[PDB]
Amino acid sequence: LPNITILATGGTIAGGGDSATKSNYTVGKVGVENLVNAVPQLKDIANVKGEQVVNIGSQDMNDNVWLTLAKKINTDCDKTDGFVITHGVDTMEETAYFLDLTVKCDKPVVMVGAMRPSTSMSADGPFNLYNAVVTAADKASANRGVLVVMNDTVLDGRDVTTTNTTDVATFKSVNYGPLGYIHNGKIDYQRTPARKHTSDTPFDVSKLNELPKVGIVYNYANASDLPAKALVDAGYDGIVSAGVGNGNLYKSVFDTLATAAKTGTAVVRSSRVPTGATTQDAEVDDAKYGFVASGTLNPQKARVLLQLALTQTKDPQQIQQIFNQY
Amino acid sequence: LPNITILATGGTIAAVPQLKDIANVKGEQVVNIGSQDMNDNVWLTLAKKINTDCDKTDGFVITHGVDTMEETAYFLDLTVKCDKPVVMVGAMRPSTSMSADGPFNLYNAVVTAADKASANRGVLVVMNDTVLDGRDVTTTNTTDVATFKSVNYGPLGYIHNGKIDYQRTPARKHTSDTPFDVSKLNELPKVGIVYNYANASDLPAKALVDAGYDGIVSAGVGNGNLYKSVFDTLATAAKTGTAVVRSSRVPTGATTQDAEVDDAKYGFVASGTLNPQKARVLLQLALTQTKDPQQIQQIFNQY
Amino acid sequence: LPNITILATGGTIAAVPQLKDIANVKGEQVVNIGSQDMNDNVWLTLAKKINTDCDKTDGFVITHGVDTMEETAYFLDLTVKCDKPVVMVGAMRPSTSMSADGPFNLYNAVVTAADKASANRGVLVVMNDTVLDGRDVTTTNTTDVATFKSVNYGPLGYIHNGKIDYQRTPARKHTSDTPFDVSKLNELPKVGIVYNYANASDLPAKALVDAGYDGIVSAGVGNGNLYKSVFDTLATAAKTGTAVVRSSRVPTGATTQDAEVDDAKYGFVASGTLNPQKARVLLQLALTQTKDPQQIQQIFNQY
Amino acid sequence: LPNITILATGGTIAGGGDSATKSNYTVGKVGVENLVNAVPQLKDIANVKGEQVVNIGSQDMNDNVWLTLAKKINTDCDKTDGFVITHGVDTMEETAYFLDLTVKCDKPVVMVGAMRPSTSMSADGPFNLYNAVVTAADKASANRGVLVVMNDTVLDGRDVTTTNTTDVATFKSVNYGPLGYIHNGKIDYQRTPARKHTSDTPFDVSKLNELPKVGIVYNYANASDLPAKALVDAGYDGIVSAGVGNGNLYKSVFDTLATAAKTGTAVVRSSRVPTGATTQDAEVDDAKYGFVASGTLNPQKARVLLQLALTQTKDPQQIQQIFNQY
């Protein structure tokens, strides 16, 4: 049986409320030990080692937790046969992407969470964590880059997102689909992400103690420029626009982002729109303004790629080619 | 044959000879913007031009860019007092394109503006052979012609062969059943939207608090949750006399109460199924009436 | 606290102490089959046991296998004359499984059977935190817990924290608004379903015509279309005195009239949004009343 | 510019009604020439050659049309740089699969159709056919097996199905997702089907003038055994069950299929259910009855695989291993 290391970070899978019925819960109160002992059947498929790295809600996920996970997975690679990372639902898609571009362990790296707290009736966390371990233990999971395993389904870190606020089935690769389905502890793998991941990326976080500063700004009718401006006045290395439709920007937001791209801030056009690419060649001259199209990356994911891009180049056209390959 | 007025706003759709088959088709250009530049002033014009010109026509069609169609449909849904069909339409493909979608969309928007059954269902969006309510409807894909969907409660009816089988009607109060009277107003309260993600900056939310914004809507993570910095700045703003509504960047499901955020403790308002841009619509109009978190939340539970 | 009766039928769900929090929970085993063996007789029992025991309780919950839940919900939807909540529930995972779905499903089915707002919405299916109408609801995935969806018109409301925000109600006539009275009947007309695909055999459709089947439903291709052999055999059957309803194997959208099939020329009935198994439900009950293609089609347009 | 051969078979893209508005149309009336000249912009991306192979509605698709297409594509492979196949919507998913297992031309083979007739307002066929040609002309489309190109989206022949009866967006790979998206005549390919296709399959139709006889039977409440029986009395080589839920069968259907599997008929359990696998190890003992699980193949697609399986073996366990690899 293979050696599997769980790195716990908290989330709802390690979450707790005074009632199994009521929807009221808090997170950061429940240790990995508890999670493992709530899933006894684990000892049938793996030798499980729990380390707590942090205990937080993922709404509170941040750069320094990201650096710590990659360095740790990179460091501990050859002392285990795979990792599961227990994590909150809320920014799971952001952390899966970041580790997808930064881990050089091509052994299975599998994120799992849960939507209902550990205390609640028909809690999803147990079967979810079991299925994370199957996937982390399956030799076929290797070289697929970093994975999210939720609701019997193996999702790639790049395309996976949360679709619903409350649904146990919220996790979906809404653009290119899942990689495989888990039935009875086996997986029929039918897809692997083509975009470059893990040991095929030039991104090395082994020495960074910081990440470039990149903010997200939202677009809508009568959008204030004050958020765009506040980020510029702080001298931000990059900004991502959550554009409307095909990555389009309200007049006021557009002019402030035009200016900043010329004083050398990286500006990436993404979209608030849940599926589909922010394309080049539509209503925006990218090459004129020194803007980069996000493609299928939603704003929070374009942030991750851009922070990582900014550590190699501040050049608009090389940052475009990074958003075309990763 | 019905008298249907087309209000043009611009967008990806701006000649369909078969309209004469179904209606007397009179048409006025209100403005000609891309809908990414849609603003409160266009909104107040549309609200008034429809409230005034209601007795004059049997129904309305509003050609609109696709980008902010869901913000304008819901605004008109809460401000319009005409319970004759009001139908918004756009197109994903240009009029100069192979298989442009715009022609059939306009046709089916006029079928829908002319159907007596379409009355009293609130402001509607007709795209891709589908009648959608102005509240739940949003754009799900950056380029697909089938982008427009009621992703929480689903569509009101399908249009086939210029006929509608209507199996649903929105329960949330719309049009003449709302206290939002916009006929005297020449500006709406200033409402911002801020985005949550990992290591979220508090500078967007601070900038808005510094301008004396009436309202701020959080595009939270998951179930409306806030990064700590933003939670700190907004917790402060909710008693500065800035109204704070928690919504989600997640494109379906409700931002609920009774989760991880004690809303009464901060004077925060859960948006329900209102995504952020839609939440700003209701939050703006709520603030023409009250700044009471308790009473703002009562309006999020009724419209 | 409401008096809620649970009718057990078997399935993947057949001890939730928190039920006492919300209702007086009395429970009777009507039958214990897997729902793949669901039949007309179970259906007539359920219809009668609910029509009789209506005055006796404040609402109903029916534990059912997931496989044929959408056929039984729609049958009960057209036959039940109790306009008190009737709520069907099952589970995708066994009760002996990690994270079994069944416990919370039953809980939320009793929340829904006990909500006064749930009255007069027809027979409901409550799965995965969601209230779905018996007509539009179907299973979309062989193993996912989120399988049950109203794929054409969407759900009636979401259940959160034992509360329902109901934003929709089915317009198609249900329960006491239908002429289907099943209280005297001990069998339903024999209706078959045949499948269309490439090089489709006419032998299924022929076998059914040879038994003197009252009705045959085509799982057509695309918009209800038929392979030539099946079209020939069914064109014949529609004037043999076998009623023929065109539905689709395609899991969403309506089988429309005015497409490629002249329905009046053959005496065929377009199913609308009724998938084949649901179409058999309505076709069976239509034939307790008429064999008139014109009048059968009128019932497909109303229920 | 590359040499692209269109093989026309009819369908709605070659369909016609007396009114652009009304939904009334017939098919089999309009020639390939017409379709090409309605898309002038084609000459910008390819040298287009039209051959009419048949003019029928795809509701009328059959074995002999299937054999003719494969033999033809196989034969004419090295006399062109790619094929588009214009086809009806209704059984497009059945023909795409069949050619996916039978063409040994690893040059792009791309099926296209349309939902609105050629005569109708905002007809989809023109842009659809243009996008079929982009895809057929794109070197990256080679070795992806046979494709369906519909509504700006490149779908694999194995997983692609029609989801809606009337919607221009009906074509979807509802299980594993699309392969790529088409914007402005370019494709970002992010996936390739893992299941074995084209020149990796043992299936050779180069000499067959017939295909084994395989029927589909539907399951539902109070399901008649008479359709199952009629297929047996005709001595059918195989039967596919459109089961309920996880590929389950009503009592009466089950017993007749149990009998036939023992007199040597191949019986495959599929599902009427639109997405998800008919799994082994659920409520049915497959190995006991000599039944094969379909996996993700819907009934019409399991038919295609089974007809092709029956031409190599009548053995239940080898037919299972074929449904596990193809």
User: Is the CB of residue D288 less than 8 Å from the CB of residue D262?
Assistant: no
Cβ-based contacts of A279 with chain B (< 8 Å): 142-143
Instruction: Round to whole Å and give the CA distance between A228 and A237.
Output: 13
Q: Contacts for B30-33 with beta carbons within 8 Å, 24 or more apart? A: B32/B8, B33/B9, B33/B65
Rg of the Cα trace of chain D? Answer: 20
Residues pairing with D295 in the sheet: D278
Instruction: Round to whole Å and give the CA distance between C199 and C228.
Output: 9
Are B34 and B178 part of one and the same domain? yes
Resolution (A): 2.3
| Chain mean position to CA A33 | 25
Q: Among C159, C189, C219, identify where a domain stops.
A: C189
- The CATH number of the domain where B109 resides is what? 3.40.50.1170
User: Is the CB of residue D23 less than 8 Å from the CB of residue C258?
Assistant: yes
Q: Do D166 and C253 touch (CB under 8 A)?
A: yes
Separation in Å, CA of C99 to nearest CA in chain A: 5
Chain B from 221 to 260: CB within 8 A of any A CB: 221-228, 231, 248-256, 258-260
Cβ-based contacts of C277 with chain D (< 8 Å): 220-221, 272
- Chain D interface test: which of B95, B98, B111 (most D C-beta within 10 Å): B98
The 10 Å Cβ neighbour count of residue A36 is: 19
Using CB atoms, pick whichever of C97, C146, C158 lies closest to residue A169.
Answer: C146
Using CB atoms within 10 Å of the CB of residue B96, give its burial: 0 to 12 exposed, 13 to 18 middle, 19+ buried: exposed
C43 contacts chain D (CB < 8 A): yes
Phi then psi dihedrals of residue B40, to 5 deg: -55, -40
One-letter amino acid at B86 equals V
User: Is the CB of residue A227 less than 8 Å from the CB of residue A239?
Assistant: no
Q: What Cα–Cα distance (Å) separates residue B25 from each residue in B113, D120, D155?
A: 11, 21, 41
A34 half-sphere exposure, CB direction, 13 A CA radius: 15
User: Is the CB of residue D171 less than 8 Å from the CB of residue D160?
Assistant: yes
User: Is the CB of residue B133 less than 8 Å from the CB of residue B150?
Assistant: yes
3 state DSSP class of C100: coil
β pairing state of A266-271 and A291-293? parallel
Helix (H) or strand (E) holding A252: helix A251-262
Instruction: Round to whole Å and give the CA distance between A325 and B6.
Output: 45
Are D109 and D256 part of one and the same domain? no
The 10 Å Cβ neighbour count of residue C187 is: 10
Are A125 and A228 part of one and the same domain? no
Instruction: Round to whole Å and give the CA distance between A16 and A26.
Output: 6
One-letter amino acid at A290 equals G
User: Is the CB of residue C119 less than 8 Å from the CB of residue C93?
Assistant: no
- For chain B, where are the E strands, in sequence order? 3-10, 24-33, 59-63, 86-89, 124-127, 130-133, 137-139, 148-150, 157-160, 163-166, 191-195, 215-220, 243-248, 268-270
Maximal C-alpha separation, chain D: 60
Residues pairing with A164 in the sheet: B252
Are D53 and D148 part of one and the same domain? yes
Instruction: Round to whole Å and give the CA distance between B48 and B180.
Output: 12
User: Is the CB of residue C205 less than 8 Å from the CB of residue C230?
Assistant: yes
Q: Which residues of B are catalytic?
A: 12
Are D171 and D271 part of one and the same domain? no
Instruction: Round to whole Å and give the CA distance between D288 and B186.
Output: 77
Using CB atoms, pick whichever of A20, A126, A151 lies closest to residue C144.
Answer: A151
One-letter amino acid at A194 equals A
Q: Among D181, D212, D243, identify where a domain stops.
A: D212
Q: Do B142 and A246 touch (CB under 8 A)?
A: yes
Tokens of B193: 């939207």
Instruction: Round to whole Å and give the CA distance between A161 and B250.
Output: 9
- The CATH number of the domain where C271 resides is what? 3.40.50.40
One-letter amino acid at D1 equals L
Cβ-based contacts of B207 with chain A (< 8 Å): 224, 226-227, 229-230
The experimental method, as deposited, was X-ray
DSSP symbol at A174: T
User: Is the CB of residue C248 less than 8 Å from the CB of residue C224?
Assistant: yes
Instruction: Round to whole Å and give the CA distance between B113 and B118.
Output: 7
Phi then psi dihedrals of residue A257, to 5 deg: -75, -30
Q: Which of D247, C108, C261 is nearest to A166 (CA)?
A: C108
Using CB atoms, pick whichever of D24, D244, D276 lies closest to residue C144.
Answer: D276
A304 half-sphere exposure, CB direction, 13 A CA radius: 26
Q: Among C158, C189, C220, identify where a domain stops.
A: C189
Task: Determine the Cα angle at C30 with ends C27 and C36, to 5°.
Answer: 120
Using CB atoms within 10 Å of the CB of residue A234, give its burial: 0 to 12 exposed, 13 to 18 middle, 19+ buried: exposed
User: Is the CB of residue D41 less than 8 Å from the CB of residue D30?
Assistant: no
Are D173 and D245 part of one and the same domain? no
Are A222 and A298 part of one and the same domain? yes
Is the four-CA dihedral C62, C73, C251, B163 of positive or negative sign?
A: negative
Tokens of C219: 């799982």
Which residues fall within 8 angstroms of residue C193, CB to CB, at 6 or more apart? C216, C217, C218, C219, C276, C277, C280, D218, D220, D223
Cβ-based contacts of A173 with chain D (< 8 Å): 177
Instruction: Round to whole Å and give the CA distance between B147 and A246.
Output: 12
> Following DSSP, what letter does each residue of C14-57 receive, concatenated?
---GGGGGT-EEEEEEEEEE-GGG--HHHHHHHHHHHHHTTTT-
Task: Determine the Cα angle at C62 with ends C56 and C68, to 5°.
Answer: 145
Q: Do B98 and D126 touch (CB under 8 A)?
A: yes
First and final C-alpha spacing in chain B: 34
Q: Do D173 and A177 touch (CB under 8 A)?
A: yes
C144 contacts chain D (CB < 8 A): yes
Phi then psi dihedrals of residue A264, to 5 deg: 100, 0
Using CB atoms, pick whichever of C153, C160, C257 lies closest to residue B167.
Answer: C153
User: Is the CB of residue A219 less than 8 Å from the CB of residue A244?
Assistant: yes
Are B166 and B236 part of one and the same domain? no
Chain position carrying tokens 């308002």: B269
Task: Determine the Cα angle at B62 with ends B60 and B65, to 5°.
Answer: 170
Which domain does C269 fall in, by range? Answer: 190-303
Known active-site residue A12: yes
DSSP symbol at C185: -
Q: What Cα–Cα distance (Å) separates residue A294 from each residue in A239, A255, B250, D96?
A: 12, 19, 18, 33
User: Is the CB of residue A40 less than 8 Å from the CB of residue A89?
Assistant: no
| Chain mean position to CA B49 | 18
Which residues fall within 8 angstroms of residue D204, CB to CB, at 6 or more apart? none
Domain count, chain D: 2
Q: What Cα–Cα distance (Å) separates residue B96 from each residue in A231, B12, D182, D206?
A: 39, 10, 18, 46
Chain position carrying tokens 């009793």: C110
Residues pairing with C73 in the sheet: none
Chain position carrying tokens 């009179």: B26
Which residues fall within 8 angstroms of residue B20, CB to CB, at 6 or more apart? none
Chain position carrying tokens 């909150």: A88
Are D220 and D197 part of one and the same domain? no
Instruction: Round to whole Å and give the CA distance between A148 and C256.
Output: 41
Are D101 and D190 part of one and the same domain? yes
Which residues fall within 8 angstroms of residue A225, CB to CB, at 6 or more apart? A252, A253, A255, A256
Phi then psi dihedrals of residue D187, to 5 deg: -130, 125
Are A142 and A177 part of one and the same domain? yes
Are A161 and A264 part of one and the same domain? no
Q: Do D222 and C38 touch (CB under 8 A)?
A: yes
DSSP symbol at A295: B
Q: Do B223 and A166 touch (CB under 8 A)?
A: yes
Instruction: Round to whole Å and give the CA distance between D325 and A198.
Output: 28
Task: Determine the Cα angle at C167 with ends C162 and C168, to 5°.
Answer: 115
Instruction: Round to whole Å and give the CA distance between A217 and A245.
Output: 15
Instruction: Round to whole Å and give the CA distance between D160 and D111.
Output: 11
